[PDB]
Amino acid sequence: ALGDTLTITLGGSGGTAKVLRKINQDGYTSEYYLPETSSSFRAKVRHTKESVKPNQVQYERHNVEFTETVYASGSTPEFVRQAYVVIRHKVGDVSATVSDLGEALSFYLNEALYGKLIGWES
Amino acid sequence: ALGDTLTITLGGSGGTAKVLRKINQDGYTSEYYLPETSSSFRAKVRHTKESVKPNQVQYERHNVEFTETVYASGSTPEFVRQAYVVIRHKVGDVSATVSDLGEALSFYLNEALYGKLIGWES
Amino acid sequence: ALGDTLTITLGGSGGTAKVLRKINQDGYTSEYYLPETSSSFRAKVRHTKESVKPNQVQYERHNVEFTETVYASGSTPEFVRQAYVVIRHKVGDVSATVSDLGEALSFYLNEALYGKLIGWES
Amino acid sequence: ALGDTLTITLGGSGGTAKVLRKINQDGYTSEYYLPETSSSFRAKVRHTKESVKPNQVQYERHNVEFTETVYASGSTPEFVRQAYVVIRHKVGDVSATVSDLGEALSFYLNEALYGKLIGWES
Amino acid sequence: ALGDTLTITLGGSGGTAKVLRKINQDGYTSEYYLPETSSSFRAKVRHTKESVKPNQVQYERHNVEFTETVYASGSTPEFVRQAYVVIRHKVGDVSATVSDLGEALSFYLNEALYGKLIGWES
Amino acid sequence: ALGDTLTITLGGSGGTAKVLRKINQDGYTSEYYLPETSSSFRAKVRHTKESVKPNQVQYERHNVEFTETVYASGSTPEFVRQAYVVIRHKVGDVSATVSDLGEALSFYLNEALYGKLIGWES
Ligand SMILES: [Ca+2]
Ligand SMILES: [Ca+2]
Ligand SMILES: [Ca+2]
Ligand SMILES: [Ca+2]
Ligand SMILES: [Ca+2]
Ligand SMILES: [Ca+2]
Ligand SMILES: [Ca+2]
Ligand SMILES: [Ca+2]
Structure with a gap:
């Protein structure tokens, strides 16, 4: 399952939703995508078994x-x-x-x- | 300068906060730790320049x-x-x-x- | 993200529907198939980045x-x-x-x- | 035997008609053309015998x-x-x-x- | 296109259906999976051309x-x-x-x- | 045990019964057989112990x-x-x-x- 679309809500809850579409799934992996003019968004899900x-x-x-x-x-x-x-x-x-x-x-x-993280605070 | 302790709240904002103590800080890297009875918790924050x-x-x-x-x-x-x-x-x-x-x-x-992830869903 | 089936309506709208079953999807590529007694139908979708x-x-x-x-x-x-x-x-x-x-x-x-095309009308 | 013009109706039926002018036909091949201020349209028809x-x-x-x-x-x-x-x-x-x-x-x-296709939905 | 889930009914038509979720599909091959508390179930469907x-x-x-x-x-x-x-x-x-x-x-x-089989009977 | 004959009922329950006869048993294996004019049926049972x-x-x-x-x-x-x-x-x-x-x-x-299987549905 998980979905056919995947929504990246920039800025977290209440932020700007970007709805990506599942475009490929190979090797226990998924790839969602949303192209735009200036940039594009991609989300990947991966499962591994050491x-x-x-x-x-x-x-x-x-x-x-x-x-x-x-x-x-x-x-x-x-x-x-x-x-x-x-x-x-x-x-x-x-x-x-x-x-x-x-x-x-x-x-x-x-x-x-x-x-803080981006500010190198440890 | 994230603080001397770091709290891991198991299960999300719900509850069961584990307050780890800072135990080391080298190379823009901090490590917190909390040894408990049957398990221990550790957190690491690292910054790098590729x-x-x-x-x-x-x-x-x-x-x-x-x-x-x-x-x-x-x-x-x-x-x-x-x-x-x-x-x-x-x-x-x-x-x-x-x-x-x-x-x-x-x-x-x-x-x-x-x-879902743990269930290997993509 | 296309769907378990793909319908080929022969003769266009209102024609004879041939609903093919998705049988594979790898590398930004889909494949649907519908075997029949005298012929079989197959549809493929491919995406490339030149x-x-x-x-x-x-x-x-x-x-x-x-x-x-x-x-x-x-x-x-x-x-x-x-x-x-x-x-x-x-x-x-x-x-x-x-x-x-x-x-x-x-x-x-x-x-x-x-x-006309089949008739070679250029 | 196609005709002096060929119309490209952008956006499909009821869309914006772009009537191109036939400018050449050789070797079982046609070519229509319509130059405009910011872009130009060109349609080609080709017939081959493998x-x-x-x-x-x-x-x-x-x-x-x-x-x-x-x-x-x-x-x-x-x-x-x-x-x-x-x-x-x-x-x-x-x-x-x-x-x-x-x-x-x-x-x-x-x-x-x-x-969907442009969106890479396979 | 067998579906997103696959049900394994332990003991035959009797009961105890385990509904596995599809987790991968590559090369005309699907894999369903259902992790449970003390064991997990997995199903694979494969097609090959010798x-x-x-x-x-x-x-x-x-x-x-x-x-x-x-x-x-x-x-x-x-x-x-x-x-x-x-x-x-x-x-x-x-x-x-x-x-x-x-x-x-x-x-x-x-x-x-x-x-009988498990008893090595032939 | 298992039987001296083995019945293959084509088409499953209620189908066409083909009664094969046990003709050989060697190496934790059995072989049943039923010859016919156009084709012949054979059933083999094998037990292994890795x-x-x-x-x-x-x-x-x-x-x-x-x-x-x-x-x-x-x-x-x-x-x-x-x-x-x-x-x-x-x-x-x-x-x-x-x-x-x-x-x-x-x-x-x-x-x-x-x-569905024969139709390559996964
Ligand atoms: Ca923000
Ligand atoms: Ca795949
Ligand atoms: Ca929880
Ligand atoms: Ca230090
Ligand atoms: Ca027609
Ligand atoms: Ca449009
Ligand atoms: Ca039982
Ligand atoms: Ca039947």
């Missing part, structure tokens, strides 16, 4: 990545803005529990914080 | 990572639960704009979504 | 292709019937505008016109 | 192509917008039948659909 | 596979339960006829039979 | 395979129709449980489904 080691816990990775590509204009070359998260847990782990850590992160990361 | 290459844009990268370490229990080995974010932008980009993309992601990633 | 070159505009290609395949019948060997379209525009162009040209072509190409 | 081979069916190609060319404007260089169709069938096939497939495609390709 | 050899019939092969993964429990390691089918026929065979053989097999394989 | 690995779960495989061999006639060379299933579980596994997964598969695989 290989089984002889004597080790086997982990799974889930990743979501937002990317705004700003096309080159004038002297200014093309560049990008990008944000993404990764969730990693062992195979049989309790979903609810794992989800809670992700929820904790989303909660932690608000506008105020992002500000 | 390798400058001749003809091309230079990016900065900011990362925040939450980690829960569940100690081994009887026959069950020790394992981890981990979630992290990475914000990447060109040097000199408009921070407010950049912040909006991160804001958009945190907003997008809620309990409902993590549920 | 070779980005130094001082030139970068284009994208969008192609859709219908193909009825009539199986060999006695003396008569197997053969096909194809019809496909290609839309080409530069990255960043205005969708509405581009779409209008495609609409213009679809509109232009009616039964009467196809008749 | 390479006759030993033990194989022989096909014929029929192609029609619309091309708006937007002249350079200040910083903005010159670029085009193309839409073209190709019909392919074996020699001797039943015109009516072949025509039906073309009609099916024209019918299929409407504004809504072009929108 | 390697064409000079003088000889060419076959198509269809496969459906159900898999239950029981996570490790204490000292007991993780293991699997798996059942799958393969239908193989010449290209262009009469599908209805082919279907009848598969139908015959599903019919033959009931609870009573599986019981 | 080798004991140092640190791994040891599995057993049970396989049943139906095969109709259609003798060559005229230009048409001899070809085959074949369907088979495989059940795989660890050695000490609970039979009833395993059986239930097999039952689930047989149940899933009905005429309707086989149709």
